[PDB]
Design a protein. Sequence first.
Lengths: 48, 211, 97, 72, 167, 133, 194, 95, 101
Amino acid sequence: SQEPMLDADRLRSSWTFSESMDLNYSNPSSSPNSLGNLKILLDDKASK
Amino acid sequence: VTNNDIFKIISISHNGFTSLENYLYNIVNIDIMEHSKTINKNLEQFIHDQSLNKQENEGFNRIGFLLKTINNINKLPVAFNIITERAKEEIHNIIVKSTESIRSKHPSLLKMATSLKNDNHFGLPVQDILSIILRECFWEIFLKLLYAIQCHRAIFEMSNILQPTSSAKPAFKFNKIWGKLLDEIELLLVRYINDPELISSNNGSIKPING
Amino acid sequence: NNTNQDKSQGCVELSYYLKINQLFQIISDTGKDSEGLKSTVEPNKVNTISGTSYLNLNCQPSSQGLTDSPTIIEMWLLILKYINDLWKICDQFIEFW
Amino acid sequence: EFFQLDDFHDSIMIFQNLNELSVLSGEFNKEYELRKTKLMYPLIWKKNKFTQSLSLHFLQDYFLKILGFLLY
Amino acid sequence: VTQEEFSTKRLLFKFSNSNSSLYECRDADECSRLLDVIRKAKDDLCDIFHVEEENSKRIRESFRYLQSTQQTPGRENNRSPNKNKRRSMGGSITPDMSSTAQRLKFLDEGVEEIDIELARLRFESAVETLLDIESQLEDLSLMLLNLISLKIEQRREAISSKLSQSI
Amino acid sequence: VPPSVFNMKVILDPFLLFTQSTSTIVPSVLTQNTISSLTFFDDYMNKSFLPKIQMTMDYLFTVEVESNNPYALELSDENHNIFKTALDFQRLFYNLLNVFNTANTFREKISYCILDLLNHFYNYYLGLFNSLI
Amino acid sequence: DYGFIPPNCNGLSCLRYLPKIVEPILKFSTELAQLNITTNGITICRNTLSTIINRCVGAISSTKLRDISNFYQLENWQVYETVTFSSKSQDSSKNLTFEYGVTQFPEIVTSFQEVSIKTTRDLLFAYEKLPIINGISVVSYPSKQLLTGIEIQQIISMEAVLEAILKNAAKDKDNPRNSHTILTLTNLQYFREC
Amino acid sequence: SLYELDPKWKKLLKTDNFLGGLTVNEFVQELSKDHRNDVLIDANTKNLPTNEKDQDAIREAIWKQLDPKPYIRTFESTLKELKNLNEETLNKRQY
Amino acid sequence: VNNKKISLKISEATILITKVVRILELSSKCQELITERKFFKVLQNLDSLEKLYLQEFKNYNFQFLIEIYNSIPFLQKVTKDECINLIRNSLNLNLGKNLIK
């Protein structure tokens, strides 16, 4: 999803924290494969 | 003792944000080199003190727990004593004790609730303002409880593995089997009382349907 | 960074995306002003009109060159962590020899 | 003249913790409305609610004049 | 250790924090000399180290780190475009602001008077009040002063927007 | 749900350092040989924190209901309503917060913010399902 | 130092941070062979030092150039933002009021700071500075490469006026759209004294 | 607006200040805040319900007519802090 | 008696200091209660005061009237000033108007 740069809106970002607001999703982390992927993900998220 | 020479102690001047250079999240946590350190230490003195009878970071663990815990002569009830006291009363003692210590140390729970910062100003001040405290607090909690249940796995081994000197080993093994069922409970509710206030959880009143 | 990129090629326009006015006067605050005067640079429309001097300290925490969260994690973490470790190693060898 | 100045600053300080702090003025305005709308050929009656004949030309220009300045 | 001999002479009320002791002395001369010599341990407690500078100067240097600088840097820090639980130091332990920012501190309440006068759409007098605040602020420009000017220019925006809607 | 809180969207202070115990006792690693109910990271990050994210989103949409079919300010238009620029402010704020890169970035946190969009189209669909319909 | 793709650059990120990762290795080197143990590897510090140093200063320069060509693109969709002037007329009569177009003022900064950083690579080799002296880098060293720095900076300012050439002429048709295209001549008119 | 805001305190506090000498400086803290002759009448302040005829405003003024009373008395104890400065005058004499 | 002298000026000085402190707080509450028919700096300066007296500035258990006053003043000053301002301009709602004709 495109943030992209703003500034919009209110406190000139007003959110701007933003560790996926809470994650890294820090899997173990220990998993550097990265798959060369993909679309990003149509996945029915495009249908969403 | 040798478990996370502290981050966020202190500040590599100047280099202040990202959260610092220490964390976040360059304090990996990978699987942690920190956990290669600590889980090298307890595997070192555990299977190498066991392998020995089959400051070295941290020699006080196997040292004090060895020459203390082997110099008992009627140990087998006392293992259940330190178990059944320490589970409830220690876990709630520490997990209460740190939040008390901050809860009057520099409190000022001012920024009382959110200061109505809508809504979804969800821990907004980090950004290093007033969640520089609670990261050090809940970090110190999960660190201390980590070295704790480490050490309870280290007495649940240390003499129970293997009968030094009691082949009735399942006491402290129970004090892992329900030792860890103790502490993983005591953190889990400390999950659910991380409610969005810096909830500070120090009342204890339990009122029925009549006031 | 970036898989399924902006493509191509993913510049932030960071000398605007930060430095429209930014660390452009905070990283440039040990940088600006050094005789960098105003001459009625009260920005007379709306917003960027503080501009007196030394300090009236804003004085930005300066997220990065702005949109670099992870790229300031890269330059910071990589370069500063590795060179920090080598500072420690050369300290220990300096004692050793 | 200052016919909402008190309502202005009232709504400011009360709107530090809006908005039941100024919600009862709906009730007071509805009440004293329902007095000032009343009556003269009774005229709080506009809520699906003789006195008809208590109205003539001076009562007319009276009535729609006073209601007109009410709307003003 | 409370002095509760009123309910029972030869009895003590030592309610240390999250505790309570009814450590009853048998005679009352030991109770009276006990709370009396604990009142002489309030000539040691309440006189030696109650505070006497301790909470005083601890409140001085500890209060002296107030909002964000004590401790300047800085490389994770700023307080530009916010109030962020604004430490009203004038109403705090300074009460004694410099007459520039003291007399403009009441003109900071005059800035709030401008918020009343804007809040009743009476722009004119609030505008000219703001002109006076620009005058005294302008001329007599020691650190919070800048943040006061931030609030001023914030409200200059509020005026310009508000008139430009109202016209 | 009555939002006392489960925890919040404030695990970003907590849930970093309290994954070290999920990786130094690596939950659950040591834990010597028994049946010990290991993970526990997730199990609440599976169950609790995800549903708390979902309902936390829902109450966050209930901080933008505002009871107006419609009213707004709108430099170009009417734009009907404060509802609209509300859901813009919400989805802009959270869609800066909850995910920026990485697209999952999510188990279904993507599908969570998608569900906030779906609720927004349900409500502003319902205005047209009320005023017109 | 980049580190990643975009912004060590435009995004003053190696412009700030690169002095740090530069300077610690400089002190580590200068100490690390300032212990003169023993010889013929102090040469190797004299190679590696100026190698990483001059390669780094070239890197900040390259970032600054290919950066700064993208500067006025997607920047000045603004109004007469910064200030003013005081340029007297032919009759020396107060005729400025020449203002403003803040893309003047930003590029007035992002080279002056780069002048400060390259000042902290040319003049880097003063402050180390101890005995033997194993002075592994000369405080005012590379007169050849100093002339090359003059060349690259001249190419940088030439890239600035090229950037206003492309951004003015076609990117795309609005300084705003004649709508003060006089804005663009106002900016250039300030650039003649900036 | 005198020591008539602390009249018996010229004995009930000041004798406990003169030869007391303060006994035991928690009473000078708390019982001089329970304030012999001043705030020993600390009862029924009370911003009086019921409805505003009786009274809700005079007892609200008398909710803090210790700001009148115990603070022209505490101010009179600040005027007795000038007597304590007079006790610091003679305590600067014999010292 | 030189230590009764130094002790007398010592505890006299400290009690003078705490007396000055509580004098400041009750002085501020007098500055709050003095403001009638203003209703604007009421919540501002009063809520600034309650942020110190019951709160961290005077958070000893020192007095009774300080504790009961600064603990009480939420509902008294907030509810009384609040509904005071609410029935304010209901006066003006009666005063607006009788000049209809």
